[PDB]
Amino acid sequence: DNVLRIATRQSPLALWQAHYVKDKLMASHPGLVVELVPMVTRGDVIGKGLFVKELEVALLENRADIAVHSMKDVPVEFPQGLGLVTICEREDPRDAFVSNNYDSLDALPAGSIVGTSSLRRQCQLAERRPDLIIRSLRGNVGTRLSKLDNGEYDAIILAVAGLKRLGLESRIRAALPPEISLPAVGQGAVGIECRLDDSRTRELLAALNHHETALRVTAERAMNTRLEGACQVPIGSYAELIDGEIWLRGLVGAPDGSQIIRGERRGAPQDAEQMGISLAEELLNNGAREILAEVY
Ligand SMILES: *Cc1[nH]c(Cc2[nH]cc(CCC(=O)O)c2CC(=O)O)c(CCC(=O)O)c1CC(=O)O
C-alpha cells in the first residue's frame, strides 16, 4: 500500500496536529497519499482514555493506520496489539496564564475566579494562593477562551503549546515556569499510536521520532505508569535534558493544596524508565498512595 490513514479528534487543535504529522510524512516520503479520518471521542461529548478510545477502536478494526494525540492525553495502558511508537519534537511545555483584565497571577485580587478542570493545575495554584476560587472549566481551546471573554472567569490556565499552534500566542499574558506549575506528562509533544505488528507503518514513521523528546517523555511516562496516573489525577511529571543527563521532577498533591509530595531524580538517558519508576515509588512511600486513594 502507498496510503496512510490518520485517525484524529475533530477540534481545530486536533486537526492542526493531524496536518503537522501529514506535512512531516509528505516531506520524508513524497510518494505517500495521506488521508484524514476525523472522529469524535467520549471526551468531546461530556474505562478511561476519554480522548483516545474511539481512535484506538479505529486502529483495531483497520479503519485507520495511525492515531495522532497530544501526549498528555495518552493513557498509560493500551489494548493488546497497540502502542505509542513515535514522539514528535517537543514544543514549549509550560502552562500559560490567560486573562483579559489582569497581567499576572499576583495581580488577581482575593476571591478572583480561575478556570481549570486539571487537579494538577489546581493543587499548585491552591498551594500558593488559597484566596483564589478555582472552578472547573471544560471544552476545546476556543470554547474556553469564549467563557473567559464572556466574564465567567477572571483568568484561565491553558498549555502554551495549544495557544501557539492555533496562532493565539497573543492570549498568553505569562508562560508559568515549571517551578510554579509543573507540566503534565508529555505536555507540549504530539504522540503517534499504531498497530505494533504493522512494520510498514512503523518504518514510515521513524523519520518523525525526535530522540531527545522521546527520552524525556519516556521518563515522565514511566513515573506516571507506576502511579497509575492520567488526566484526572493531581500528578505533575516533567523531564529536561541538562548536560547529558535527564533531570526528572514529579509531584502528587491534595487538590486543596494542603499537602504536596515532591521529588526529583538525575541520571543517564539510558536509565529513563528505571529512574521514573524509582521516583514514583519514593512518592508513594511518602504519602502519594493516600492522596491518590482519596482521589480514586
Ligand atoms: C490530560 C489532560 N487533558 C486535558 C484536557 C483536554 N485534552 C484535550 C482537550 C480538547 C482540546 C482541544 O482540542 O481544543 C482538552 C480540554 C477539554 O476537553 O476539556 C486536561 C485538563 C486541562 C484543564 O482543564 O485545565 C488534562 C489534565 C492536565 O493537564 O493536568
Side-chain angles (χ1 to χ4, degrees), residues 1-41 43-47 49 51-296:
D1 201 296
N2 86 307
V3 178
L4 200 66
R5 302 167 289 165
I6 301 183
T8 178
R9 277 176 63 251
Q10 280 178 330
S11 68
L13 182 60
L15 292 166
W16 182 94
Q17 294 182 163
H19 276 89
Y20 165 86
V21 170
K22 174 183 164 137
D23 289 353
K24 295 307 168 142
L25 282 176
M26 308 251 274
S28 296
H29 312 286
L32 185 70
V33 178
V34 179
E35 298 176 4
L36 311 184
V37 187
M39 57 189 60
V40 308
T41 70
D44 292 298
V45 329
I46 157 126
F51 298 105
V52 318
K53 208 42 92 151
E54 288 96 328
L55 305 187
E56 286 181 322
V57 169
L59 298 178
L60 281 176
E61 61 198 22
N62 236 285
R63 283 169 25 230
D65 301 311
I66 67 166
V68 171
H69 309 288
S70 296
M71 281 301 311
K72 70 178 201 171
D73 295 308
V74 180
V76 287
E77 300 180 290
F78 293 95
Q80 160 170 18
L82 301 187
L84 184 94
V85 304
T86 303
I87 303 174
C88 300
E89 185 179 5
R90 207 173 188 161
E91 169 59 71
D92 192 320
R94 293 173 296 168
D95 283 333
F97 176 73
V98 182
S99 188
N100 293 318
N101 309 140
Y102 303 96
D103 300 79
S104 65
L105 208 44
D106 307 326
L108 292 176
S112 289
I113 306 160
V114 179
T116 178
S117 233
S118 170
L119 294 180
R120 164 189 72 83
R121 292 173 166 150
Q122 181 174 145
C123 75
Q124 302 179 78
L125 260 166
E127 173 192 43
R128 291 199 315 290
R129 285 299 297 273
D131 57 316
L132 289 182
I133 302 151
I134 296 161
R135 192 150 284 169
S136 189
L137 172 56
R138 286 294 319 289
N140 294 334
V141 173
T143 282
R144 291 181 178 236
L145 293 174
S146 294
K147 297 179 177 265
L148 170 68
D149 294 348
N150 298 349
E152 293 180 38
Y153 305 90
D154 288 299
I156 64 173
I157 308 301
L158 293 174
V160 162
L163 295 172
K164 282 177 92 182
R165 283 165 171 165
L166 289 175
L168 304 175
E169 215 167 322
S170 73
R171 295 289 205 144
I172 296 165
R173 306 291 258 158
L176 303 177
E179 300 74 26
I180 294 296
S181 191
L182 193 69
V185 177
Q187 191 158 277
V190 164
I192 304 168
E193 172 179 25
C194 78
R195 285 181 305 268
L196 297 176
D197 70 352
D198 187 359
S199 49
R200 175 207 52 136
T201 297
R202 296 186 66 178
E203 313 170 307
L204 289 176
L205 283 186
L208 270 70
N209 193 73
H210 185 251
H211 188 51
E212 187 194 311
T213 303
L215 285 181
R216 294 174 67 181
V217 173
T218 291
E220 301 165 358
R221 288 188 55 82
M223 209 297 293
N224 255 271
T225 294
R226 180 69 181 85
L227 296 178
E228 301 160 46
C231 300
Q232 94 102 169
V233 277
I235 300 169
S237 170
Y238 177 60
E240 289 199 326
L241 214 67
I242 304 300
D243 289 329
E245 284 187 308
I246 292 170
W247 177 28
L248 172 74
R249 286 175 274 184
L251 68 74
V252 177
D256 68 0
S258 58
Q259 202 183 338
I260 299 201
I261 316 314
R262 288 177 162 95
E264 76 183 316
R265 286 289 197 273
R266 197 163 320 224
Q270 325 75 236
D271 299 319
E273 195 179 14
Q274 295 301 320
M275 275 162 46
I277 292 169
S278 303
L279 176 56
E281 286 179 343
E282 178 181 310
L283 295 187
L284 283 168
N285 290 333
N286 250 323
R289 192 169 267 126
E290 304 50 57
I291 292 170
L292 293 176
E294 297 158 342
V295 160
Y296 304 131

